[PDB]
Design a protein around this ligand. Sequence first.
Ligand SMILES: CCCCCCCC[P@@H](=O)OC[C@@H](COCCCC)OCCCC
Length: 311
Amino acid sequence: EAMLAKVQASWAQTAARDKARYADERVPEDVHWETEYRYEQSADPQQTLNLYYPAKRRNATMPTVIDIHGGGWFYGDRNLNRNYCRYLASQGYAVMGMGYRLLPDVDLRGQIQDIFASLRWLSHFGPQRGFDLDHVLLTGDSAGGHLASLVACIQQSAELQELFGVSRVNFNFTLVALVCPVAEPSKLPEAAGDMSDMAAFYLDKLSGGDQALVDHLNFSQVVKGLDLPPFMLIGGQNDSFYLQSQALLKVFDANHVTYTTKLWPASAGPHLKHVFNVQHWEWPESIETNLEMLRTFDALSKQQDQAEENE
Ligand SMILES: CCCCCCCC[P@@H](=O)OC[C@@H](COCCCC)OCCCC
């Protein structure tokens, strides 16, 4: 397939830019990582995760961040977002970032299963090595934001658990922060001009032809009727997928989702493009955005502690 070849060549271009950026970019200081843990009994290299920590721990456990990377469901691995994960860790958080098998080798159901396996691994083994699972920030960027938004709903719903073939994990998400998410991919082939066929191709690979996945491919289809944690929507008017952020706010309002936003206006400049705060941790706006996210997380964690007579 020439379409698959075309999709892959666009990601190999993205991969070259990612490689060059990383060669140059400053690396956050004072962090330790532990790499390449298998989260299940398999030799698939995507079924692995990294853990990150401040080099000096203020306590034995630290509030938890779990990151789902982006890349259009076709690209990336547990290393793609390492500088971002390191940044967040450097601020006194214990951080897990996972790989998941890529399209077209799997479909959405296999990617959701991988993510849940990484979450289940962490419920078993995280606390003994520093993860406070009472305070959990789930975050994802772009396709990773899609995935995070679905995982959040699936975690709350026995029906979706059964449909996606996963079990709930023994912790809750305190906050879900989506960074330039593409949470309504069904909307992609609309406009997209001469790219509609490619966008339709993404959707077919995500669904694997399973009509139940087709009917559950969008945040708008999985949100219905659930009591969810709060969300934070991060991005800006210069995100190539800003329309997806606009569309998601409409779904939030219609479903009484509690949320806050950190949306950069066009006036804040042409550099604030898609996933800028993940790809460029050291920029002042990335710092601001990411600290704001962590502050929002801390505020909710403190309210939870007060509510639970545990302040
Ligand atoms: C034809 C319609 C395809 C829909 C692609 C969905 C990409 C969302 P995101 O993971 O990636 C964000 C951004 C890339 O951001 C930089 C790399 C992020 C890992 O956009 C990808 C553009 C290539 C098609």
